[PDB]
Amino acid sequence: SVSSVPTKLEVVAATPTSLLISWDAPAVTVVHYVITYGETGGNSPVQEFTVPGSKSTATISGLKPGVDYTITVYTMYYSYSDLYSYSSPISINYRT
């Protein structure tokens, strides 16, 4: 009954080719967060990287100016029943 999905995912700061994102940690032992990003339009490849469980912010670089990106974050977390598993994602859209 305790959610392992992060909440309040948002872009706190932006440049034309980068985004600083932050989220609220879920009340579980997060080992790492997995950040995904890709162009909202169609069939650009979605890319991912991990961030440590202690951090609740990430920087996404190498983006194109004036382009809509879909950004998702999910956790790789420890719980009692499931051991290490992956949460569902929380997701936002942002235009550079």
Partner: protein, 125 residues
């Protein structure tokens, strides 16, 4: 060895079941030091301590009941492996202070409860 095996299984199954119920109910309330896993280790520490003092005074107890309580119940109720993954996960999460605190509170706490169990019964008798 068959009567001794039933003692271990009956006691062990009640212990494992208790650990499972208490852990699923309480561990998620405070994930830095899951209290269900702590409580079962503390409680097993308490029971084995009282068993320590009690069995000393009843030397003619059937080995069946001693084996059901210690190897069975306490053995099944307590857990070292669940304590370890909790700590391992915390280490992997970079949460070193709670990894250390968990280890200390589990070890120190379990020995304290063993002492309390032993001395309460020793003082009663």
């Amino acid at each position: 060895m068959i009567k001794s095996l039933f003692a271990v299984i009956i006691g062990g199954s009640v212990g494992c079941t208790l650990r499972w119920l208490l852990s699923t109910k309480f561990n998620s309330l405070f994930p830095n030091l899951p209290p269900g896993t702590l409580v079962v280790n503390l409680l097993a520490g308490l029971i084995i301590g009282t068993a320590l003092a009690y069995f000393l005074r009843q030397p003619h107890l059937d080995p069946f009941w001693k084996l059901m309580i210690t190897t069975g119940l306490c053995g099944g109720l307590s857990t070292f492996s669940t304590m370890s993954v909790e700590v391992f996960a915390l280490l992997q999460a970079g949460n070193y202070i709670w990894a250390l605190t968990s280890v200390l509170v589990h070890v120190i706490g379990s020995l304290i409860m063993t002492a309390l169990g032993f001395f309460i019964i020793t003082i009663l008798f």
